[PDB]
Design an enzyme around this catalytic site. Structure first.
Site, PDB file in Angstrom:
ATOM      1  N   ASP A   1     -10.484   0.457  34.042  1.00 25.48           N
ATOM      2  CA  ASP A   1     -10.669  -0.871  34.737  1.00 25.48           C
ATOM      3  C   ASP A   1     -12.073  -0.949  35.340  1.00 25.48           C
ATOM      4  O   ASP A   1     -12.772   0.057  35.501  1.00 25.48           O
ATOM      5  CB  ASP A   1      -9.602  -1.145  35.785  1.00 25.48           C
ATOM      6  CG  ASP A   1      -9.549  -2.630  36.200  1.00 25.48           C
ATOM      7  OD1 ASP A   1      -9.970  -3.518  35.441  1.00 25.48           O
ATOM      8  OD2 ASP A   1      -9.096  -2.894  37.304  1.00 25.48           O
ATOM      9  N   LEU A   2     -12.507  -2.163  35.668  1.00 18.40           N
ATOM     10  CA  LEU A   2     -13.789  -2.369  36.313  1.00 18.40           C
ATOM     11  C   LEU A   2     -13.618  -2.344  37.844  1.00 18.40           C
ATOM     12  O   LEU A   2     -13.974  -1.371  38.495  1.00 18.40           O
ATOM     13  CB  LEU A   2     -14.406  -3.679  35.825  1.00 18.40           C
ATOM     14  CG  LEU A   2     -15.805  -4.046  36.290  1.00 18.40           C
ATOM     15  CD1 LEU A   2     -16.836  -3.098  35.709  1.00 18.40           C
ATOM     16  CD2 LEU A   2     -16.153  -5.456  35.840  1.00 18.40           C
ATOM     17  N   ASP A   3     -12.974  -3.354  38.399  1.00 17.76           N
ATOM     18  CA  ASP A   3     -12.808  -3.442  39.841  1.00 17.76           C
ATOM     19  C   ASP A   3     -11.961  -2.289  40.366  1.00 17.76           C
ATOM     20  O   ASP A   3     -10.888  -1.990  39.830  1.00 17.76           O
ATOM     21  CB  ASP A   3     -12.103  -4.770  40.174  1.00 17.76           C
ATOM     22  CG  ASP A   3     -12.017  -5.025  41.651  1.00 17.76           C
ATOM     23  OD1 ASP A   3     -12.982  -4.681  42.400  1.00 17.76           O
ATOM     24  OD2 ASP A   3     -11.001  -5.661  42.033  1.00 17.76           O
TER      25      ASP A   3
ATOM     26  N   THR B   1     -15.698  -5.643  42.476  1.00 17.07           N
ATOM     27  CA  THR B   1     -15.874  -7.076  42.239  1.00 17.07           C
ATOM     28  C   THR B   1     -15.129  -7.904  43.282  1.00 17.07           C
ATOM     29  O   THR B   1     -15.448  -9.081  43.464  1.00 17.07           O
ATOM     30  CB  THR B   1     -15.401  -7.540  40.813  1.00 17.07           C
ATOM     31  OG1 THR B   1     -13.982  -7.380  40.636  1.00 17.07           O
ATOM     32  CG2 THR B   1     -16.174  -6.797  39.726  1.00 17.07           C
TER      33      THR B   1
ATOM     34  N   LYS C   1      -5.747 -11.748  46.210  1.00 18.93           N
ATOM     35  CA  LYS C   1      -5.893 -10.693  45.192  1.00 18.93           C
ATOM     36  C   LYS C   1      -4.785 -10.680  44.148  1.00 18.93           C
ATOM     37  O   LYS C   1      -3.586 -10.698  44.466  1.00 18.93           O
ATOM     38  CB  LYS C   1      -5.991  -9.304  45.833  1.00 18.93           C
ATOM     39  CG  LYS C   1      -7.306  -9.054  46.525  1.00 18.93           C
ATOM     40  CD  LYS C   1      -7.193  -7.731  47.273  1.00 18.93           C
ATOM     41  CE  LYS C   1      -8.524  -7.269  47.834  1.00 18.93           C
ATOM     42  NZ  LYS C   1      -8.275  -5.979  48.551  1.00 18.93           N
TER      43      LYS C   1
ATOM     44  N   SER D   1     -10.521  -4.542  31.409  1.00 18.32           N
ATOM     45  CA  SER D   1     -10.624  -5.335  32.650  1.00 18.32           C
ATOM     46  C   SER D   1     -10.394  -6.812  32.375  1.00 18.32           C
ATOM     47  O   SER D   1     -10.827  -7.354  31.367  1.00 18.32           O
ATOM     48  CB  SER D   1     -12.011  -5.178  33.254  1.00 18.32           C
ATOM     49  OG  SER D   1     -12.281  -6.120  34.284  1.00 18.32           O
ATOM     50  N   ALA D   2      -9.725  -7.457  33.304  1.00 18.10           N
ATOM     51  CA  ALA D   2      -9.543  -8.903  33.247  1.00 18.10           C
ATOM     52  C   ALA D   2     -10.811  -9.683  33.599  1.00 18.10           C
ATOM     53  O   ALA D   2     -10.831 -10.925  33.459  1.00 18.10           O
ATOM     54  CB  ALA D   2      -8.411  -9.320  34.188  1.00 18.10           C
TER      55      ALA D   2
ATOM     56  N   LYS E   1      -2.188  -7.792  33.085  1.00 23.88           N
ATOM     57  CA  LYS E   1      -1.566  -6.650  33.779  1.00 23.88           C
ATOM     58  C   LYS E   1      -0.507  -7.280  34.712  1.00 23.88           C
ATOM     59  O   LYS E   1      -0.842  -8.278  35.335  1.00 23.88           O
ATOM     60  CB  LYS E   1      -2.607  -5.902  34.602  1.00 23.88           C
ATOM     61  CG  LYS E   1      -3.691  -5.243  33.743  1.00 23.88           C
ATOM     62  CD  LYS E   1      -4.924  -4.873  34.525  1.00 23.88           C
ATOM     63  CE  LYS E   1      -6.015  -4.358  33.587  1.00 23.88           C
ATOM     64  NZ  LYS E   1      -7.162  -3.824  34.342  1.00 23.88           N
TER      65      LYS E   1
ATOM     66  N   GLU F   1      -7.171   3.531  36.970  1.00 25.81           N
ATOM     67  CA  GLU F   1      -6.817   2.290  37.681  1.00 25.81           C
ATOM     68  C   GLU F   1      -6.572   2.573  39.150  1.00 25.81           C
ATOM     69  O   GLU F   1      -6.288   3.697  39.535  1.00 25.81           O
ATOM     70  CB  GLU F   1      -5.589   1.561  37.104  1.00 25.81           C
ATOM     71  CG  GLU F   1      -5.926   0.405  36.167  1.00 25.81           C
ATOM     72  CD  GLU F   1      -6.337  -0.867  36.917  1.00 25.81           C
ATOM     73  OE1 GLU F   1      -6.674  -0.787  38.118  1.00 25.81           O
ATOM     74  OE2 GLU F   1      -6.266  -1.965  36.318  1.00 25.81           O
ATOM     75  N   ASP F   2      -6.780   1.547  39.947  1.00 19.07           N
ATOM     76  CA  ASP F   2      -6.537   1.620  41.395  1.00 19.07           C
ATOM     77  C   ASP F   2      -5.397   0.711  41.845  1.00 19.07           C
ATOM     78  O   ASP F   2      -5.052   0.730  43.027  1.00 19.07           O
ATOM     79  CB  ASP F   2      -7.810   1.255  42.120  1.00 19.07           C
ATOM     80  CG  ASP F   2      -8.100  -0.221  42.078  1.00 19.07           C
ATOM     81  OD1 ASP F   2      -8.013  -0.840  40.991  1.00 19.07           O
ATOM     82  OD2 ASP F   2      -8.456  -0.762  43.145  1.00 19.07           O
TER      83      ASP F   2
HETATM   84 MG   LIG Z   1      -8.714  -1.988  39.323  1.00 21.65          MG
END
Ligand SMILES: [Mg+2]
EC number: 5.4.2.6
Length: 219
Positions: A8-10, A16, A45, A114-115, A145, A169-170
């Site tokens: 994932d990015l964020d 982000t 979020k 990532s979305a 997701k 992932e977080d």
């Molecule tokens: Mg994430």
């Protein structure tokens, strides 16, 4: 050994969420609504842009036309794209650049799952593009997701099955998506948030190639 890592990015490569928050806060200020702070932002979020705007409007019991709703939603996005012009390599989370280097040197594939509609832009501004073998395009993926679709797409784009891959992932939804794709999740954050059934690291500095290997061998 695992053949790919699906990022994932964020919350893994960078933050982000900060920029979405700033974009909504600036929008709310522009139309004179108070209360869009970091705590309120927790309600935005993982939520659609329509749903978010509706929640902000409710803070002042403000009513809008369909035309005004559309303009405000566009304005948030314009705000966001302006605010991410500031992104740089200084925004890469700790450990991540070294991990990408080591993956690449070990011929392990690297994909973004990532979305983010600005994923390629963000990776380029962070000078990470060269490490990525693919970026899954969220526009070409049918479900978000916690559906596994984006992780499946990211694996396939680098020529692997998800079962040959680790997902980083977080978020709860992301971890579930990784699980349902067939990939092995390794979470970053707290088991209070992500569950006791997966390996979790407290921050991204613990995501090292050596650690990923040990986790894979032990699964
Ligand atoms: Mg994430």
């Amino acid at each position: 050994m695992f053949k790919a890592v699906l990022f994932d990015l964020d919350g893994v490569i960078t933050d982000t969420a900060e920029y979405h928050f700033r974009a909504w806060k600036a929008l709310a200020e522009e139309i004179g609504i108070n209360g869009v702070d970091r705590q309120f932002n927790e309600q935005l979020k993982g939520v659609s842009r329509e749903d978010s705007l509706q929640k902000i409007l409710d803070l002042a019991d403000k009513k809008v036309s369909a035309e005004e709703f559309k303009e405000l939603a566009k304005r948030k996005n314009d705000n966001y794209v302006k605010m991410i012009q500031d992104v740089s390599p200084a925004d890469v989370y700790p450990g991540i650049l070294q991990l990408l280097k080591d993956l690449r040197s070990n011929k392990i594939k690297i994909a973004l799952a990532s979305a983010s509609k600005n994923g390629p832009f963000l990776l380029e501004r962070m000078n990470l593009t060269g490490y990525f073998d693919a970026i899954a395009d969220p526009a070409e993926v049918a479900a978000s997701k916690p559906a596994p679709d984006i992780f499946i797409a990211a694996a396939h784009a680098v020529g692997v099955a998800p079962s040959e891959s680790i997902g980083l992932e977080d978020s709860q939804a992301g971890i579930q998506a990784i699980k349902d794709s067939g990939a092995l999740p390794i979470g970053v954050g707290r088991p209070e948030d992500l569950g006791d059934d997966i390996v979790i690291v407290p921050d991204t500095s613990h995501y090292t190639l050596e650690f990923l290997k040990e986790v894979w061998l032990q699964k």
